[PDB]
Amino acid sequence: ALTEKDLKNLPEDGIDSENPGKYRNLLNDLQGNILKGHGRDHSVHLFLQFKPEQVEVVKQWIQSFAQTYITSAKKQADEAFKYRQKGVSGDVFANFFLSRHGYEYLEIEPFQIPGDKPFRMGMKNEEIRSSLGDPKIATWELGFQSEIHALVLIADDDIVDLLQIVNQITQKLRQIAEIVHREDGFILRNQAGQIIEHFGFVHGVSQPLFMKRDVVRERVNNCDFDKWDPKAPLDSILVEDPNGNTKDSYGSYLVYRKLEQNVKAFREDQRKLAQKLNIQENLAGALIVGRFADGTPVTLSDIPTYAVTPTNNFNYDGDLAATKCPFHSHTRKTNPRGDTARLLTTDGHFDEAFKEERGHRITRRAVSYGENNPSKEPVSGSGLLFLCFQSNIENQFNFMQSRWANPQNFVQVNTGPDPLIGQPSGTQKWPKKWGEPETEEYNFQLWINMKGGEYFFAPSISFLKTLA
Amino acid sequence: ALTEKDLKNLPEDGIDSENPGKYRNLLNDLQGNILKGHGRDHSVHLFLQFKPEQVEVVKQWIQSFAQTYITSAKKQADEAFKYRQKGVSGDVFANFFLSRHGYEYLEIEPFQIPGDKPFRMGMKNEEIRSSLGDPKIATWELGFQSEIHALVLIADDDIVDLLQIVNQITQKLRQIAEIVHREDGFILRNQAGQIIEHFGFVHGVSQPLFMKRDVVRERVNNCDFDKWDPKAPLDSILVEDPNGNTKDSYGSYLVYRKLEQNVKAFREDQRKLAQKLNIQENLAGALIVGRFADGTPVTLSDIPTYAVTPTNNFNYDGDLAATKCPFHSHTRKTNPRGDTARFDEAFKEERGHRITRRAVSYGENNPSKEPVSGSGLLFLCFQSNIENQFNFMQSRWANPQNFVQVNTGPDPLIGQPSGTQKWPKKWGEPETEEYNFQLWINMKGGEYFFAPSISFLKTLA
Amino acid sequence: ALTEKDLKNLPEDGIDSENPGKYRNLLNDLQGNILKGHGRDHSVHLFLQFKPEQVEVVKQWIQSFAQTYITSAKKQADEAFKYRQKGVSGDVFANFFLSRHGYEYLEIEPFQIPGDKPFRMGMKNEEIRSSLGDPKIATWELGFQSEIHALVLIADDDIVDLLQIVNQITQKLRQIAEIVHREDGFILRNQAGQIIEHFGFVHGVSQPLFMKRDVVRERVNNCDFDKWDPKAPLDSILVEDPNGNTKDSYGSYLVYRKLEQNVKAFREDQRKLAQKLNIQENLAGALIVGRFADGTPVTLSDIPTYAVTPTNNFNYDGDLAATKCPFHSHTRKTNPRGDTARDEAFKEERGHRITRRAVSYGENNPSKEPVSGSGLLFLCFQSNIENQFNFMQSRWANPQNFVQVNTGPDPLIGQPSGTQKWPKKWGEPETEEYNFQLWINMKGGEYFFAPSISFLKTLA
Amino acid sequence: ALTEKDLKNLPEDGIDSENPGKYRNLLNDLQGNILKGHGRDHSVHLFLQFKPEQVEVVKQWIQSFAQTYITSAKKQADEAFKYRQKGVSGDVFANFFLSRHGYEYLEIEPFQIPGDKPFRMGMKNEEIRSSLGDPKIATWELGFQSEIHALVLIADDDIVDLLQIVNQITQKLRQIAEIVHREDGFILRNQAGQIIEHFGFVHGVSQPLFMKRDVVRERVNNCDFDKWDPKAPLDSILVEDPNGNTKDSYGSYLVYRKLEQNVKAFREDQRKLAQKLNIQENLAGALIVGRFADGTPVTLSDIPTYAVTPTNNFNYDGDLAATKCPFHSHTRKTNPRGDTARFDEAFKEERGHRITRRAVSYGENNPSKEPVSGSGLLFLCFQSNIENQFNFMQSRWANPQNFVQVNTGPDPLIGQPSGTQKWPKKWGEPETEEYNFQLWINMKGGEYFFAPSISFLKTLA
Numbered sequence A: 001a002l003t004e005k006d007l008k009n010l011p012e013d014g015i016d017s018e019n020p021g022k023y024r025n026l027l028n029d030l031q032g033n034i035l036k037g038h039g040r041d042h043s044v045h046l047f048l049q050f051k052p053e054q055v056e057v058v059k060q061w062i063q064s065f066a067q068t069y070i071t072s073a074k075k076q077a078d079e080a081f082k083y084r085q086k087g088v089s090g091d092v093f094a095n096f097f098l099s100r101h102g103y104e105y106l107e108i109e110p111f112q113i114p115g116d117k118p119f120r121m122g123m124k125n126e127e128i129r130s131s132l133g134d135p136k137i138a139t140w141e142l143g144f145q146s147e148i149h150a151l152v153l154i155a156d157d158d159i160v161d162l163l164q165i166v167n168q169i170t171q172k173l174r175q176i177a178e179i180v181h182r183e184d185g186f187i188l189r190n191q192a193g194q195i196i197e198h199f200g201f202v203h204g205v206s207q208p209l210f211m212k213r214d215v216v217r218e219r220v221n222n223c224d225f226d227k228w229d230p231k232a233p234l235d236s237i238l239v240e241d242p243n244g245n246t247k248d249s250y251g252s253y254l255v256y257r258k259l260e261q262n263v264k265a266f267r268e269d270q271r272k273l274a275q276k277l278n279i280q281e282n283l284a285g286a287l288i289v290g291r292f293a294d295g296t297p298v299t300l301s302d303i304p305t306y307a308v309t310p311t312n313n314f315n316y317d318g319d320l321a322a323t324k325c326p327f328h329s330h331t332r333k334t335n336p337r338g339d340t341a342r343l344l345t346t347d348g349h350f351d352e353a354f355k356e357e358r359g360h361r362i363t364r365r366a367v368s369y370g371e372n373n374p375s376k377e378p379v380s381g382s383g384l385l386f387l388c389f390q391s392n393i394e395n396q397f398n399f400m401q402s403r404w405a406n407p408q409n410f411v412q413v414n415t416g417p418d419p420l421i422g423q424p425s426g427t428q429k430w431p432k433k434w435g436e437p438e439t440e441e442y443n444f445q446l447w448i449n450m451k452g453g454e455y456f457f458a459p460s461i462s463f464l465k466t467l468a
Numbered sequence B, D: 001a002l003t004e005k006d007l008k009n010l011p012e013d014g015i016d017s018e019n020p021g022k023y024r025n026l027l028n029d030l031q032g033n034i035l036k037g038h039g040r041d042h043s044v045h046l047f048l049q050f051k052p053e054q055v056e057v058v059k060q061w062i063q064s065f066a067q068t069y070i071t072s073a074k075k076q077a078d079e080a081f082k083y084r085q086k087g088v089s090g091d092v093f094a095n096f097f098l099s100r101h102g103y104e105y106l107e108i109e110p111f112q113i114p115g116d117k118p119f120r121m122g123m124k125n126e127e128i129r130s131s132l133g134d135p136k137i138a139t140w141e142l143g144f145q146s147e148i149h150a151l152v153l154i155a156d157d158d159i160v161d162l163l164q165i166v167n168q169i170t171q172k173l174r175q176i177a178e179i180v181h182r183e184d185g186f187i188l189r190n191q192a193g194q195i196i197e198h199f200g201f202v203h204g205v206s207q208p209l210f211m212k213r214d215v216v217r218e219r220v221n222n223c224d225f226d227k228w229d230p231k232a233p234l235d236s237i238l239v240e241d242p243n244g245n246t247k248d249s250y251g252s253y254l255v256y257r258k259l260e261q262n263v264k265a266f267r268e269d270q271r272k273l274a275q276k277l278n279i280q281e282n283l284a285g286a287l288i289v290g291r292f293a294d295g296t297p298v299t300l301s302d303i304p305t306y307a308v309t310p311t312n313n314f315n316y317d318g319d320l321a322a323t324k325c326p327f328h329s330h331t332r333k334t335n336p337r338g339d340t341a342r343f344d345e346a347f348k349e350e351r352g353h354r355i356t357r358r359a360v361s362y363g364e365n366n367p368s369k370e371p372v373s374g375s376g377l378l379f380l381c382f383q384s385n386i387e388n389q390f391n392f393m394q395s396r397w398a399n400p401q402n403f404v405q406v407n408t409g410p411d412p413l414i415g416q417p418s419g420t421q422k423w424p425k426k427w428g429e430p431e432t433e434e435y436n437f438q439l440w441i442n443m444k445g446g447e448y449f450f451a452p453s454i455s456f457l458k459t460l461a
Numbered sequence C: 001a002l003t004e005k006d007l008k009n010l011p012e013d014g015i016d017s018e019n020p021g022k023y024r025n026l027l028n029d030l031q032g033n034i035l036k037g038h039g040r041d042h043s044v045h046l047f048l049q050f051k052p053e054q055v056e057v058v059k060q061w062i063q064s065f066a067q068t069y070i071t072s073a074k075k076q077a078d079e080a081f082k083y084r085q086k087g088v089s090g091d092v093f094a095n096f097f098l099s100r101h102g103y104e105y106l107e108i109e110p111f112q113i114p115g116d117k118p119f120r121m122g123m124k125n126e127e128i129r130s131s132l133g134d135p136k137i138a139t140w141e142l143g144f145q146s147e148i149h150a151l152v153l154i155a156d157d158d159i160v161d162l163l164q165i166v167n168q169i170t171q172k173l174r175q176i177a178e179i180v181h182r183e184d185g186f187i188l189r190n191q192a193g194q195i196i197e198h199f200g201f202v203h204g205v206s207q208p209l210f211m212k213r214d215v216v217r218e219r220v221n222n223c224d225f226d227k228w229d230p231k232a233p234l235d236s237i238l239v240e241d242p243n244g245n246t247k248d249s250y251g252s253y254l255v256y257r258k259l260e261q262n263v264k265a266f267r268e269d270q271r272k273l274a275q276k277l278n279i280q281e282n283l284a285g286a287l288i289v290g291r292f293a294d295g296t297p298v299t300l301s302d303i304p305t306y307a308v309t310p311t312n313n314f315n316y317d318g319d320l321a322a323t324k325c326p327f328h329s330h331t332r333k334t335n336p337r338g339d340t341a342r343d344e345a346f347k348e349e350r351g352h353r354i355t356r357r358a359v360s361y362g363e364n365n366p367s368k369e370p371v372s373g374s375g376l377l378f379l380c381f382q383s384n385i386e387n388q389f390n391f392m393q394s395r396w397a398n399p400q401n402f403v404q405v406n407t408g409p410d411p412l413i414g415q416p417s418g419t420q421k422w423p424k425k426w427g428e429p430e431t432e433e434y435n436f437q438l439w440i441n442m443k444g445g446e447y448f449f450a451p452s453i454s455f456l457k458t459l460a
């Protein structure tokens, strides 16, 4: 019975998984890892292509997997609650995702396939590739060149147990599917214990928030959200599953991209940038990313502050000319925190324009691959397994990459591409002295390579359980 | 060339140790641990009485110690910078302090001895004892009953190495001095990794800030400064060293007090208070201290809320009647945040009484245990004027029953003598009930010292 | 050159990898993990079926794998030496094995396929199954019911890294092969840090030894060799690779069996046995296995004694009537230490030994009691499967009359189960009958050959 | 009752601390750390000189320390038992030792002072120094140049708590004694978790054994002692305390020596030796010490075996020509395992020279580093006769060039003065080459003490 209103407006404290009220049925039929990350230290990603002419036994397998393993949002919350209260660790965590091709394999009518246009086109689609600035599909890792039908995600803190359970699951799975690709994701940490990505920066700091446990935690640590509200409405991440079987059956769209990071070359380019500007290497890093390695926002400081829990309580209102945090910095390109509402609004509707800007946000659930020692500097074979959720790929991930990160004239003319993820690489203007207007041009090179991926839908659990 | 102006007004971002500008010479000749704490996990405190008739060899020893070991504020900042940037751990940290009696031992002329009156009088002085409400000197631990000339402080994160270095240092030291007392300080922590004191409360939260690294961290991570500005001027902590060699030779006055904490009895009294008011035990704690054990200010909340960086950008403007945080609570007694001004001139004066705390713990290192005796706080603080700062805070704020208002009662944590407080029955409502919270902290000994400029110590012989 | 003499007689200190003498060329072309275990904490086992009509590209893949990853015995020894001397870890460990079906897929002429008869027949063969007392092939786990061509084994101490490297390897591999089954092996330990198996017993103690580093360690730290000599000749494990590129090209035959252990039921049966005999649970365990859980040989003691290096320099000469260690106990069945010879007969008895390279699967917490899904990935090497593993199972463990009439089957591994006679009091003759049940289930496996490296490097 | 027989013959399984039988009174009145090491990870050593004319208050202090802190052998065993059985940690461990000078300070009559001649002479005695090959007393560290009366030893696994307890103990102690020197001992370990000394070799492997727990553990791990019996009779370590309160009152003589180890130079010398002989560096180490770094005996192997618990089950009967383990190697010099008997009576006499080691490390705690000075071994050992045990071992075995055979040369590790050894070119073959391995251990000070019975100390005042 959830209305338009209920989906467009998050409660003030978020959705309370212990007292869900009208969101109870939703949480029971929605898969986990969407509204709140599964939080497990290890994961396995199995990309599947179902075997020809085996539709009925495939459906039986999916059904059994949904009955036995898939974790709902309610189950995810209950497992976290039982762990905190009684030290009892829960079952493995599991998600199941379908591509558009997967829906076709399953003989679901076109009109019943999730409607998102990028999801239907697929990440190999030439128009999609062109719009993202992505490389040719022939450059992708072999696993991703196959037609992918589905993704199985299994996660757990105990790696050896995770491997055993995966090996059990795969016995029946292999009868009906080719496993065309596998990843074993993990969480990289720095010596302070912060979660980082391979270039050494704390990662996952700024997220749309939905669940009470997150909202309340973030509020107490971010000054009552007095500079930035991280809450987001449910309709920025959920969509009705057109084939769900409850009054409140929802899913979300997944973007999966394997992003290789050339750490050695990145560090060299960062040092060179620092030498050219005659600044500290750590500040050069902060100008590229928008934060110091520890998470300190460069809009707020020209030095790292080393807080283990970095602040998210800022906007760029004290930095309108972007002489502290440049317009090109990754954080400011991907989350303008109002820049588009000021700079690109001429009818004066700041509030409406800011709401629209905020509607482009993505909910990240990324993990690392490759080298697990963060002191090392891999050239290839290490990076980020980029996963994010949204209700509209065209308006969220694709928008963020194609309209914000890539273009040289966003948010203002001659900003240049995002030096971390913008394709193609180009020219940025860097402040010589933090907080002062004079800049110098430097072409920071793109040290991230797209190695493959796909768009999926996370269906409602009831859909999956009644497929056979 | 630092002027009156430079000393009375801190720069907006504090003193930048990596780009010190006009403060460069000051930072080279000022000892560390004053403007910013040494931050090491372990320390050794050696209290000295120099041996009679050995003035010249004592001076030679002090000179060698200053040349080899003493850490300047600049060196301290450089060691932290090298550690962050390259993982290289620095030398051991060291301070050296002299008492007035120590200056006299060294045959320094009276006009050249630091001028602070409490420092000159000494912590054993009867007037000082009476003013502080302190116990009789005959009750102090034996080590502190000796005439103390100096204090050597050595600190390091690696405890075993620290002990070896100390044992090396003490070989030549014992030739020229009696070590009359030793402490081995350490940092107590809660399960979240926050620094606490033996009663279980997060500790060292609210400080005067001077250095850029501290000022910016606080501003960025603790919600800016619009309710409470933690910056302080240099003249609230530094004093020109009358015997320094440089144009910018400064020191500071140290108060050292060994404060024994009866954890078992404190917890019992806290439970009895809670049960008398029919409130949660954690809230009873918060009414005694002014914060919950997790650091949550009781003026802002009647429950703990677990902020990772405990809140400090607040004042009592939403709590004028003190029915959330009582006037008697330790934090509100020791930092009234404008109560005395209730303006601008009066608040500046009020803020001039602040102290810069550099305390460490002694005794039991397992924070789950409940020692009765032999555990507590090695209370160290710095200031430019002991009469106006530590002594003022203890004698005029914490102890009196009529500060800040009539019948407030003494600070139930540190006030001497103990007395009667009025406790709100319901947080945020006016009705109170009287309860005599007992004093569970005992003064076991201490002394006042001066941290001299490094150049003074390096050219003493 | 290696002569018959060199293969039939191990040097007194074993083969010295750092000064190999006449064995130098052999160690260069022989895969690791055979003469000495790879010693890595984690492993991944990938069972392969090559895709139809892709023989040439399969050969190219195998060749690249042999050039890039396969660890020789010389490389294995060098990696251990560099690790001890300089702390440098070095590469992942890798083996590659072929089944007879794999040889046929690769269009290798029959006269060139390794000659061992069980190997050629395959572990699914009905005569093999019957001989071993094995269950029907339809009861096997699904992965093992496919026709298996090859096994890729990759191992490393750093599990996360191992997983990344495996995922890299499998990208090109999947183009030319189905991965029909996977295991992730790991090492179970007790609180003292000794390697154990799921029933709780220290495991991997008694082995044929070949390399100096093993021989000397064992001699120095395990009380010399005067009661039991653990050395074995190279011809008890190595076989000439008919397709190697020199006369010094050797391989070995691998037996792989997934053996599920019902820990819960085993412990109950052990407790019931102990109650029936009115003895301590731990002694009942020792009578089943031949050792206490801590490794203490039950022939030597009726109590555990916690030796750090579990004892292996013993025989049953003080226990001829088997009233301390019964004739049915697992250790005494699988290694009679002279019972069958009661000189030439003892040498023959010792020729049946197997070199074990097993690892665990399933539950990694050894305090738990899984019913199914946990056990031992049993791997062993030999030069002659008929005379070694198959002999040990079919002629020693299984039969009721080995080593003497009415001994009964090995209560741990004997198939089918039956009746054992158990001493009421250790060291005294009176026994009582009890049918210990079989709590190990064969879930699948295959026989393979580990070829010489030069064969694999020049296959395309 | 204890008879001559009981003291000259250890029971087959050693003394059972849980069931002591005839040894019950002995274990109550005997200090710990003698028959079995205290096994604590940290210790503090306080060397004392009692203050002139304060004999009676010194006696009262010693009495209170014996009543409150000193650990008997029985208490030590009970604390270990409770810890294993219930996880309950015990009190700190403590010993108290007196020098001959300390006995004289306490006005104990000469006939009542322990009779051992080296003990009475003192380690500063010129004839003692000459006999040991020791350096001039003026080269010792300053702390050891004082007249030392006593040594207080306090030990615990929890370093911070140990420090606090020591600081408490020293308050009353300082009233009646000068603390002339302090060490903070610790246990150095290699990456495998084995206890090592600074040169990197596993240390403490071969010991005389007395207590059942040790005897049984060692027996099971050493092949039922079939090559070497490590047991020793009680009279090789215990001495009747002439001033104990019963006939079951015993003590032992302590040798304490601070031995500095030049790790950097030792490693260079080892590498030079290896290059000259064209052998592996690890084997060169084994030829110096008698064992590889991991403990593997070089008499048994020319390669390390890396067993975490090294074997002790060997003698040199497979190596009579000493071409595997040279006659000069430290282990073979200090424990010939029958070389001097080459029988039964001579081997018994040879075994009577053994010492029971209770050493700990000082200085650098990171074993990967290579200190030149300031790091080493705090060498402690016990015996019933210093002349026949430690002094005999150093002066008659380690030092002489003609022990055990002509032109063996000094022990290259500890022999003073240094000289020439003959090293086998190829392990197990006779041809040798001369190389002068240098002495990289420096004696920095020490003293001989007696560990008195507890009853003596408890009734001293």
Ligand code: HEM
Pocket (backbone or CB within 6 Å): A197, A198, A199, A201, A202, A203, A204, A205, A206, A207, A259, A261, A289, A291, A330, A331, A332, A334, A335, A362, A383, A384, A386, A397, A400, A401, A405, A420, A421, A448
């Ligand atoms: C290997 C590739 C990438 C790296 C290393 C990376 C790194 C980071 C870092 C260090 C942060 C700052 C801390 C945080 O809030 O998490 C961040 C934030 C973020 N990144 Fe990325 N990023 C990557 C790819 C992407 C891509 C492809 C997108 C979207 C198209 C994206 C969108 C975001 C967003 C939305 C934020 C949060 C901005 C905010 O709310 O302040 N990132 N990224």
Ligand code: HEM
Pocket (backbone or CB within 6 Å): B197, B198, B199, B201, B202, B203, B204, B205, B206, B207, B259, B261, B289, B291, B330, B331, B332, B334, B335, B355, B376, B377, B379, B390, B393, B394, B398, B413, B414, B441
């Ligand atoms: C064992 C004795 C003491 C204990 C257990 C103790 C405990 C605490 C605690 C828990 C806080 C709150 C957190 C913080 O800001 O650090 C605090 C604050 C403080 N204490 Fe103490 N204290 C002790 C002695 C003293 C003494 C003797 C003084 C001065 C005479 C003092 C002055 C202060 C001041 C100035 C603050 C900061 C108040 C603010 O700015 O809000 N304390 N103390």
Ligand code: HEM
Pocket (backbone or CB within 6 Å): C197, C198, C199, C201, C202, C203, C204, C205, C206, C207, C259, C260, C261, C289, C291, C330, C331, C332, C334, C335, C354, C375, C376, C378, C389, C392, C393, C397, C412, C413, C440
């Ligand atoms: C899950 C199945 C099995 C378990 C739990 C198991 C367990 C053990 C145990 C605890 C030992 C004693 C310690 C040792 O020397 O390793 C051992 C020894 C041994 N086992 Fe097994 N075993 C299993 C299967 C097999 C099979 C199938 C064979 C051969 C057909 C075998 C052959 C041996 C041999 C040869 C020894 C060494 C005996 C000796 O030399 O004293 N085991 N086994």
Ligand code: HEM
Pocket (backbone or CB within 6 Å): D197, D198, D199, D201, D202, D203, D204, D205, D206, D207, D259, D260, D261, D289, D291, D330, D331, D332, D334, D335, D355, D376, D377, D379, D390, D393, D394, D398, D413, D414, D441
């Ligand atoms: C810094 C000085 C010394 C070092 C580094 C050192 C090192 C060692 C090492 C590595 C061992 C072999 C393992 C073991 O403990 O059994 C050992 C054994 C021994 N050392 Fe020392 N040692 C030192 C000084 C001394 C001195 C001064 C003596 C006697 C005068 C001595 C007597 C012994 C004895 C008796 C053994 C055992 C011999 C045996 O029973 O096999 N050591 N030493």
